[PDB]
Amino acid sequence: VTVTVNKNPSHTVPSTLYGLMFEDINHSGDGGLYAELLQNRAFQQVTPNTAAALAAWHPISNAKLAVIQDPSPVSNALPNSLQFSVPSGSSGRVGFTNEGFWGIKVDSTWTYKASLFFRFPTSSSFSGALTVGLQTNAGRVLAQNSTQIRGTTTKWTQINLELHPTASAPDVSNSFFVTIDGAAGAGQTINFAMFSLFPPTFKNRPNGLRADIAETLAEMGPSFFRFPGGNNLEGQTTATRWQWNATVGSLLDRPGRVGDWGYVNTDGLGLLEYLQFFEDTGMEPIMAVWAGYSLGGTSLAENQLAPYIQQAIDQINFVIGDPAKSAPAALRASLGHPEPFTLRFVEVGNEDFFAAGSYPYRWHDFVTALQAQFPQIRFIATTNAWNPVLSPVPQSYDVHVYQTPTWFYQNAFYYDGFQRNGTTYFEGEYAAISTNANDLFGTVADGRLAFPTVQSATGEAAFMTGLERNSDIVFAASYAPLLQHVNSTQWTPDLVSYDAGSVIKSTSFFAQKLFALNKGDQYLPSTLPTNGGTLHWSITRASSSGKTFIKIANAGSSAQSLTFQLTQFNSVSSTGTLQVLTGPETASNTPEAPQAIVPKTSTIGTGKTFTYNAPAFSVSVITVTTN
Numbered sequence: 140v141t142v143t144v145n146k147n148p149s150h151t152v153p154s155t156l157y158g159l160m161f162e163d164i165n166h167s168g169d170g171g172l173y174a175e176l177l178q179n180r181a182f183q184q185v186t187p188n189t190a191a192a193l194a195a196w197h198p199i200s201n202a203k204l205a206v207i208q209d210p211s212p213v214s215n216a217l218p219n220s221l222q223f224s225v226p227s228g229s230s231g232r233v234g235f236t237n238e239g240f241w242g243i244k245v246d247s248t249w250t251y252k253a254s255l256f257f258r259f260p261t262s263s264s265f266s267g268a269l270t271v272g273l274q275t276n277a278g279r280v281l282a283q284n285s286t287q288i289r290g291t292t293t294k295w296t297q298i299n300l301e302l303h304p305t306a307s308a309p310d311v312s313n314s315f316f317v318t319i320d321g322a323a324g325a326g327q328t329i330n331f332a333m334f335s336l337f338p339p340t341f342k343n344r345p346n347g348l349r350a351d352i353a354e355t356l357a358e359m360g361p362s363f364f365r366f367p368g369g370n371n372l373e374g375q376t377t378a379t380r381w382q383w384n385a386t387v388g389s390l391l392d393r394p395g396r397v398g399d400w401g402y403v404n405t406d407g408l409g410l411l412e413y414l415q416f417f418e419d420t421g422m423e424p425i426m427a428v429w430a431g432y433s434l435g436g437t438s439l440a441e442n443q444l445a446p447y448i449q450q451a452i453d454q455i456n457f458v459i460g461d462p463a464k465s466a467p468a469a470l471r472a473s474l475g476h477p478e479p480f481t482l483r484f485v486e487v488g489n490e491d492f493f494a495a496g497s498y499p500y501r502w503h504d505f506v507t508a509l510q511a512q513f514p515q516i517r518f519i520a521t522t523n524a525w526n527p528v529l530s531p532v533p534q535s536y537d538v539h540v541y542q543t544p545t546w547f548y549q550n551a552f553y554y555d556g557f558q559r560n561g562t563t564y565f566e567g568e569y570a571a572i573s574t575n576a577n578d579l580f581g582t583v584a585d586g587r588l589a590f591p592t593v594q595s596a597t598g599e600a601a602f603m604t605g606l607e608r609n610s611d612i613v614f615a616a617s618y619a620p621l622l623q624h625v626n627s628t629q630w631t632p633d634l635v636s637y638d639a640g641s642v643i644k645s646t647s648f649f650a651q652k653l654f655a656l657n658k659g660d661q662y663l664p665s666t667l668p669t670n671g672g673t674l675h676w677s678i679t680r681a682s683s684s685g686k687t688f689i690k691i692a693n694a695g696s697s698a699q700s701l702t703f704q705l706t707q708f709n710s711v712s713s714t715g716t717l718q719v720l721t722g723p724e725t726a727s728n729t730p731e732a733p734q735a736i737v738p739k740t741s742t743i744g745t746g747k748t749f750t751y752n753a754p755a756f757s758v759s760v761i762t763v764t765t766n
């Protein structure tokens with residue numbers, strides 16, 4: 140195929156074209172990006188006196204454990220405590236462990252910060268050391284530290300101890316422990332609350348993020364971060380929706396909530412931690428607000444919305460408001476960040492195409508109020524575009540699609556037919572999820588992808604060339620989901636996977652990275668690909684340097700030759716860089732083979748006219764300099 144590349148651009152490529160979509164799914168927040176190592180650290184949103192309330196906690200020796208509704212809890216937000224009892228007639232180490240999120244990486248180059256609160260519910264004669272530490276799951280101590288406590292301590296008391304392992308563990312099958320001497324402790328009861336164990340964090344932020352994951356996200360060169368959902372925004376009912384103000388301030392004051400993926404969220408990854416991550420990485424937010432619908436099916440009635448609209452105003456004021464003018468903005472300043480954060484885009488709800496009967500009045504009432512308070516923000520509608528008709532007219536829509544790899548290359552012209560009428564489009568969730576057109580959301584046995592494949596990433600890349608061609612109206616696009624804990628998964632495939640110790644970069648990750656890191660500010664129109672075909676391309680140019688990025692997706696089973704014609708340019712470099720992602724159709728990066736499929740860089744001969752053989756199932760970027 141002969142591809143003519145015009146010198147005169149057709150439009151400016153948005154700075155926001157490629158970015159990330161986050162919600163806490165597959166333990167992407169708790170157990171993932173948020174660096175806390177203890178699971179069920181504060182007994183949030185569990186039922187006292189059940190086995191479920193003790194999830195992740197285990198006795199050492201003859202310890203007796205129960206989660207209680209404490210008569211004198213550590214805080215209003217944290218009503219549950221761990222009741223630890225040592226039988227009379229005891230000796231030797233006694234206590235309890237936390238298994239982490241399916242393990243804990245123990246590294247001799249890391250300092251860990253352990254903390255907990257305790258009190259004796261009945262004043263006692265106990266006198267002895269409280270030891271915290273890390274052990275292998277077979278019981279070998281890796282690190283420990285201790286402090287003296289007394290049974291006369293009936294008031295809540297925080298212990299803060301560092302841990303300094305001298306040797307790394309051989310694997311991640313390790314636990315945090317708390318012990319006393321069982322002879323000293325015989326017959327004693329202690330109540331505990333609000334445990335925490337942190338490793339070193341990204342940018343050394345207090346209450347911050349897991350560095351290997353945070354660095355992997357920054358490596359893809361994203362421009363935006365959509366958060367906090369996604370389904371995790373919505374709750375199952377009004378009462379269990381995400382609420383900004385429950386996620387800020389002391390961890391003692393964050394109640395947590397039951398999320399939308401079968402597990403409790405601590406809300407330790409809260410609004411300020413998100414915003415600080417954006418500052419640390421150069422991303423801008425696309426922030427969602429709850430919009431009167433929850434996943435159990437209930438829409439608030441129109442005459443019930445006012446307090447929820449106010450809460451959305453408060454949320455935005457926390458991010459951008461003048462501290463002198465609102466309580467939320469004053470709270471951001473009191474938490475150490477008096478300058479406003481950047482916020483250009485707010486999404487109204489999530490997937491309101493499931494509740495399109497009520498979205499017209501919810502959209503109308505939310506956006507009327509929010510646009511008046513925040514004239515500069517662009518509000519994003521979540522129903523299917525133009526059906527139903529919304530008032531006020533949306534300036535943006537969020538479009539989601541989960542489909543087969545084949546659908547993606549067949550639908551690369553999705554935006555070409557749209558009118559250009561001042562509305563922009565956010566492809567806020569997309570992925571090729573299954574090879575089974577008849578059951579997309581099924582099991583791996585029935586075609587669901589466990590991990591992205593070369594097939595899936597190449598189909599996505601073909602669709603992405605269409606997003607880039609149509610970036611006069613498409614302003615943003617993000618794969619979903621972003622993150623997966625391989626030991627606790629509710630959705631596959633995912634962009635980036637991990638266990639307690641290591642990260643896996645998928646084929647799709649590398650397609651996202653190749654697109655985002657090789658993107659000019661000028662879109663150069665070219666000969667169109669075949670609508671419905673397997674071979675697609677998109678060309679952009681950096682206005683300041685002349686670097687010219689030719690992105691090619693061959694989503695089919697045969698190699699195809701392209702002849703690029705750049706004769707409209709006065710000069711084209713005689714060599715270019717070539718970056719190629721390819722492999723067997725069904726190949727994936729997995730925990731067992733995490734680098735099976737990675738990009739390869741080389742040089743190729745270029746000029747005013749030059750050829751390139753795009754392999755079957757490949758994503759290629761050719762970079763030349765043009766003037």
Ligand SMILES: *[C@@H]1O[C@H](CO)[C@@H](O[C@@H]2O[C@H](CO)[C@@H](O[C@@H]3O[C@H](CO[C@H]4O[C@H](CO)[C@@H](O)[C@H](O)[C@@H]4O)[C@@H](O)[C@H](O)[C@@H]3O)[C@H](O)[C@H]2NC(C)=O)[C@H](O)[C@H]1NC(C)=O
Nearest residue numbers: 523524525526528532533553554556557558559560561562
């Ligand atoms: C700005 O440009 C937009 C993009 O071109 C315009 O969007 C179009 O808006 C009209 C309403 O004004 C929509 O038309 C409705 O279509 C439905 C039926 O639809 C569906 O089936 C067709 C096959 O026929 C399919 O293409 C869709 O995906 C659906 O499966 C009618 O029942 C209504 O009475 C009405 O005709 C278009 O659907 C819509 N196009 C797209 C691509 O979304 C928009 O109106 C413009 N906005 C302004 C303010 O001017």
Ligand SMILES: *[C@@H]1O[C@H](CO)[C@@H](O[C@@H]2O[C@H](CO)[C@@H](O)[C@H](O)[C@H]2NC(C)=O)[C@H](O)[C@H]1NC(C)=O
Nearest residue numbers: 250252253282283284285299300301302303304
């Ligand atoms: C036990 O924990 C304490 C408290 O975290 C550690 O003491 C700190 O050590 C660091 C690094 O040497 C100092 O910067 C702090 O000033 C110390 N704080 C206090 C309150 O003393 C101590 O190193 C830990 N001991 C072991 C064996 O891990």
Ligand SMILES: *[C@@H]1O[C@H](CO)[C@@H](O[C@@H]2O[C@H](CO)[C@@H](O)[C@H](O)[C@H]2NC(C)=O)[C@H](O)[C@H]1NC(C)=O
Nearest residue numbers: 216382383384385392393394446447449450453
């Ligand atoms: C977060 O703020 C919301 C208000 O924006 C609080 O919810 C209100 O709580 C009061 C007292 O229980 C109720 O009478 C109101 O009906 C609630 N309003 C809404 C909109 O839900 C919520 O309690 C705050 N969360 C925390 C942890 O303090």
Ligand SMILES: *[C@@H]1O[C@H](CO)[C@@H](O[C@@H]2O[C@H](CO)[C@@H](O)[C@H](O)[C@H]2NC(C)=O)[C@H](O)[C@H]1NC(C)=O
Nearest residue numbers: 240241242312625626627638639729730731732
């Ligand atoms: C967490 O998931 C990992 C990755 O799947 C598990 O490690 C694998 O375990 C299987 C079954 O024992 C082995 O065949 C693989 O070779 C292991 N893979 C790797 C890369 O080590 C791990 O066991 C899981 N952890 C828990 C606690 O279930």
Ligand SMILES: [Cl-]
Nearest residue numbers: 543544545574
């Ligand atoms: Cl397919």
